[PDB]
Design a protein around this ligand. Sequence first.
Ligand SMILES: O=c1ccn([C@@H]2O[C@H](COP(=O)(O)OP(=O)(O)O)[C@@H](O)[C@H]2O)c(=O)[nH]1
Lengths: 370, 366, 366, 370
Amino acid sequence: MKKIAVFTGTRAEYGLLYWLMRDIQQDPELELQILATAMHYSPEHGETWKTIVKDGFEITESVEMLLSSDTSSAVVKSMGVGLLGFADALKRMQPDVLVVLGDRFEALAVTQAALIMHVPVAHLHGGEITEGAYDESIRHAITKMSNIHFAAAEEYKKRIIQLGEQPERVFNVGALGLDHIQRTTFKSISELSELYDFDFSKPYFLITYHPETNLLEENVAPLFDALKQINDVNFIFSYPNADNGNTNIVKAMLDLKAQLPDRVLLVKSFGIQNYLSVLKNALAMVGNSSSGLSEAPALQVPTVNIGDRQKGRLRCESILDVRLDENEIVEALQKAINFPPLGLGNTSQKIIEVIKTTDFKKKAPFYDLL
Amino acid sequence: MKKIAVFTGTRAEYGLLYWLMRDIQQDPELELQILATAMHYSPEHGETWKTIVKDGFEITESVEMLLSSDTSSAVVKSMGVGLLGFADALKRMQPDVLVVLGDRFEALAVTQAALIMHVPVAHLHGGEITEGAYDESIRHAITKMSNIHFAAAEEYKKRIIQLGEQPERVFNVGALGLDHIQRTTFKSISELSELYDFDFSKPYFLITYHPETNLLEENVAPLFDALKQINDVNFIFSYPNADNGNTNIVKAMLDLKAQLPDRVLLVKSFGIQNYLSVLKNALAMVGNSSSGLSEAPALQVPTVNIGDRQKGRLRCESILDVRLDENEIVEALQKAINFLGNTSQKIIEVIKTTDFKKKAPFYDLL
Amino acid sequence: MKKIAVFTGTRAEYGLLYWLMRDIQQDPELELQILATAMHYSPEHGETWKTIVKDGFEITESVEMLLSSDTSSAVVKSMGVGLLGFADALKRMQPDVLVVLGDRFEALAVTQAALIMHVPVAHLHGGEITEGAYDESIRHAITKMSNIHFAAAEEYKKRIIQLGEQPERVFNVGALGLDHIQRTTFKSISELSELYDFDFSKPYFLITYHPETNLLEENVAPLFDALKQINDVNFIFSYPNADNGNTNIVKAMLDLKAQLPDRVLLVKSFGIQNYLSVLKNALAMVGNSSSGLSEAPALQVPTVNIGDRQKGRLRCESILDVRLDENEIVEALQKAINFLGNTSQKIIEVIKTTDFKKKAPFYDLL
Amino acid sequence: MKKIAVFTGTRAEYGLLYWLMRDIQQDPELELQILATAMHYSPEHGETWKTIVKDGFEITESVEMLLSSDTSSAVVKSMGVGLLGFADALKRMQPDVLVVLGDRFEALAVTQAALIMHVPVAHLHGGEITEGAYDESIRHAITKMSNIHFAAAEEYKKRIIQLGEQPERVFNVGALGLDHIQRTTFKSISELSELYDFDFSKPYFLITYHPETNLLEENVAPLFDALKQINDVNFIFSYPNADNGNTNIVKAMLDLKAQLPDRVLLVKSFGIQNYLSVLKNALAMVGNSSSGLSEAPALQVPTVNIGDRQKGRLRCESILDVRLDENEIVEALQKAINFPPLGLGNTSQKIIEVIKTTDFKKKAPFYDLL
Ligand SMILES: O=c1ccn([C@@H]2O[C@H](COP(=O)(O)OP(=O)(O)O)[C@@H](O)[C@H]2O)c(=O)[nH]1
């Protein structure tokens, strides 16, 4: 009975890890532990740890750590509190394996805590290329302190190889989140249209434009005016998150809903099942969400990628890359109406297979390229 | 006038950094800051911040962080305390750059603290390999969180470039500590003998064994049982570092000193000037310290390197690699009985000539 | 020149401390230090350190400490972070005396920090009773860890003395905040309606309800239901403090605002110049704030005190004490609708003329 | 099934709490929890938590917290780490009652943490008066944040009452440690004499001189010189603690035994059973230990109390108080060869009875003496 502890710090990342947690919980050979921390205990986001409990899981250890502040100094302090909690948490849990996904600073903290305390780390989504002040550097740092690696694609795996990891410790298992695509029973057009009292049979664009944190120059107009110049198609939207530019986007939306209440639908939180059901019958996922570069291509729905929020990500034919001016965009919406590396969506079982069949208690020797 | 903050957590790496700090202090165009932490403030390690103060330096910020408990969890908690201190300390120094040397856990904490607070990192001694310690993965992680890199060898520069760093941000400047070999005055036999009240005239070994942190269970007895079998040779010890597993080594040391008080000298921290003076006159550098892979060959003194804490670093014919095994260690000890220096200015130059306030993009290999 | 560090964690007690801080700043024989922390650096409480800076004060040391999680365990952790910051902040200010006012948990953290580090403490507003909050036991613990005490009334001085404090170390100097009533210029209703874009020309309750921390389960619905039942009256709010249980109050405030948007004004932080101006022209001070037991009766403004958070403090004639009950809050609201300045000088004189570096022995009642 | 969590931070304090811990563990109505922290995880003192486990107890929660430093700043930091660990520790234990003894700063930290988290505190040894930089202030602060109080004597109980505690929340139950006296089966002189290869039939003084911390470096001769002046009498010693100035004492001892290799006995650690067995047949407990003001009087063995280390405690007929003057000492030893408030030693059972029969979930209203 191997103890596999899954680390989770945010609602979205937990949504990525959901099916792996479910599979471990279902498997009688593997005991699932959970270490929930960071934004799961922020009132800002509604204490999303309760969601973990409502989906049927038991939080083994909880570490509140986030300071109530927007300074970087307070992020360092939050990381210190995180380390102090993770010391006793891992001390009590004694996991056989710790699962860490992504590149957030709390994941770096728990990764180094596991390194010092000899808890082998399985890192998910290593070797990728993103944007930000430091998210990528942190991602590679987490890679170097992890014992086994589950990359979402072959080039990510090979960049992990270049990072010094031995090839027998890196596995291309696809993107874990896409398991939802494989395991969702989708809602029909009828069901979506009666649950939201809005007709989905008429063609619709689905959009999630999240605030570009560094792009302070967030003129919101260049796209939605471009949605007024394209007719015949409805606009269904869900709401952005909590960054710097949240309101200036949200009202850009709501006035293009006040202007045409008979072409626009506003959904606060979709839920992964209804979200994928809405995206499934779309002519385009447009915006800068990561769903545009994974879930939309896996559903054979084209995506028109606006801005550089998703720069560095694997591109595919369904991706149509554009900026935030009006011209170049509409050719891309039409270019959606006129017509994969990340895998199919069985990532959880591949990960479990590797964990059951591979010894990785020790960090393998550094791998030098000839 | 740019603010060059230098991080130091042990007497060791402080001695490695001495000439960079002194040359930055000397340069009127650069303002030296100092962030001293960790072993510099533990009395079980000598309270070596006093040495920093005695050498004319001003400690800008001090951060006490080491928990006394000798466990890995207490190391992690020590790192958390460190982070909590570095948040304010860095918040206040507002350095133009942070210089970090090495691969220890406090260096990891301060490096991620600087990265999150957008303070560029100049990392020294990256691209090296020490498989037996978790300092290995820590070292590569610090490399990935650093903006500019100063390697001590071409092999290490190559490994740093392989880690995805842009080659225009990696420089081969040699070992900063070896500058001492040219710039620091050494002490004679009688000076050491008088200030340490120990007869350095009789042949001795210089011994420094730190816990090999990737060892599941670490029984250091084969080393000490080894040294007893050598006759007519004295034993001079430096204390192990603050990594978890060091109190066992300390106990074995006080045991050996308790048995042979006329032949064993226990020094918590030497002086690095005094340490290089003692090392030069030693029959051998014995243990698993990095000084056996750099300072000892540069002073033409053999190395009895024990275990895997140094596995991966460059070798030379004066390096006797043995396992923590009594027979191998004694054989290597008897075998040990019977048989261009401008790094600081290169680094300072590169720091004044190069813009590295942003992490360059990941460098894929063609 | 003697160093007087003043501790401040909320905009409230900063306002109460203003004239002491300013008069220390004006005395050339006293150097003013400031240790600001807690709610001053949380965006959910207005980031009220900017008010400290705008009033011409220099923040000698800032320590962010508040965790965003709204639990009692997160409050404990916040006290831990506070301690870890106060260690270095006090290590560096090296103050001759630390002035702490009140009974909040951050005041407990800093008071024990100064006690351990041998910084004598001048405690303000000890000897008072607020049974409904854990600030009660906190306050008396701060009293027993303080070297000199400045009470607000004779009964409070008496209770401080019963706590074992030497009578020669306890002074009834009055309430420092009430110095504002004598020394601060108030704002007119025209200006108050200008800067907040809200017509103060119309009758309004000023409401401030903090979490009663000794309540097992706290539902603030009766207060808001009672406020809804009042017609032709506006509702102006300040936000609850950082004590655990405040985000439910915030939720109820945003709910009442989304229900009655034209009659509800939500202000995270006023200016205390602005807050005393708003309280002066308010119909009633509604809630459980301590201003209802001091500033509001001083300004001849009736107060509807709810619950036991203020239970024990001296009661004026204009004090309507109701339970967290819809009926009595309605009754007190309608009934409300239907009808000196030298403390800073005294405290400064005592601090300048009295030795209190060492805690006097326990005073047994003879 | 009440959950009673006993807090412990030092080996000696655990030795005081031992019999209450034993009684709670044996009592089927009460679940015993243990929160071990502070000096139990200091290598300086040998990791005394192992002692707790070896005596048969289970450590429910452990919090490493002590910084490796002699500064007061590092004590404040250690207190912060303590708070951060106690938050999650109490979060997990959810004790019905937390028992806190003494006046150490870690006990103040856990007491205020319990206060914030609504864990009722039973405080032991409140209302006493000692000499220290701040230990008494901390003791009274712990009293003010505790819900029920178990004083060692009537005057302590009454000072707790003066501190504002309601009389129905303060109970004089005697000194907990003296329960050892009631429950020890003593070693005979024979057994002691072969166990230590030293003859106990010859009259012997028992001495524990601890370095008076405020008496930074002590002139120890005024005492030892007074012990060479007494002949026909042996001198048995145990070793002092680990403070600032002990070593010149340990060599003052080792040198007044190296002079008389056949009249002095030096024991590093006695153990409570052998210690009380030695003290029972002693001529006097002389020195400045706390055993001189509790265990020695309870065994009807006179005490020669030197210095001000025990200033403030209850004195009794058995106590003969003496400065560190050599003459003034010698008359006191003679008068020791010439010829209680803290109770008999059933404190644990009285405490347990009170806990079983009293509700103290809430802090009682402040008690004003009219
Ligand atoms: O008690 C000591 C122990 C070591 N060092 C220094 O440590 C350096 C290298 O040895 P160390 O083992 O500390 O470094 P590491 O092996 O961890 O890299 C040398 O320059 C010494 O000057 C010292 O000065 N005093």
